[PDB]
């Protein structure tokens, strides 16, 4: 049928609130609130600093800590979520300009 509204799935170049639930040696991982869907995603190493030299996660992000991530890319059960791009102040898009990587 006709109908949209979508909500229980995060949505593609949104942004939306999170809190790091585990920090790995390479990255954190990142629970998204709000949505119905309990989703959990990923933040790489290089998904927390500019084009860099990165020592460790560990001082980049505490456990229980809020933060806040952007919906890079939902696919099945893998849900993608960047950092670096939603600053960490009010939470505006860092993204000017991007390309899509693979399809």
């Avoid at 980049?60 to 919906?71: F, H, I």
Wanted: hydrophobic letters at 30%; glycine letters at 12%.
């Amino acid at each position: 049928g006709s109908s949209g509204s979508s909500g229980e799935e995060p949505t593609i170049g949104d942004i939306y609130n999170g809190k790091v639930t585990s920090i790995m040696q390479f990255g954190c991982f990142v629970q998204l609130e709000g949505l119905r869907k309990r989703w959990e995603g990923l933040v790489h190493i290089s998904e927390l600093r500019r084009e860099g030299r990165v020592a460790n996660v560990a001082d980049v992000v505490s456990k229980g800590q809020r933060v806040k991530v952007k919906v890079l890319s939902f696919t099945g059960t893998k849900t993608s979520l960047s950092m670096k791009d939603v600053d960490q102040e009010t939470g505006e898009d860092l993204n000017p300009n991007r390309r899509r990587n693979l399809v």
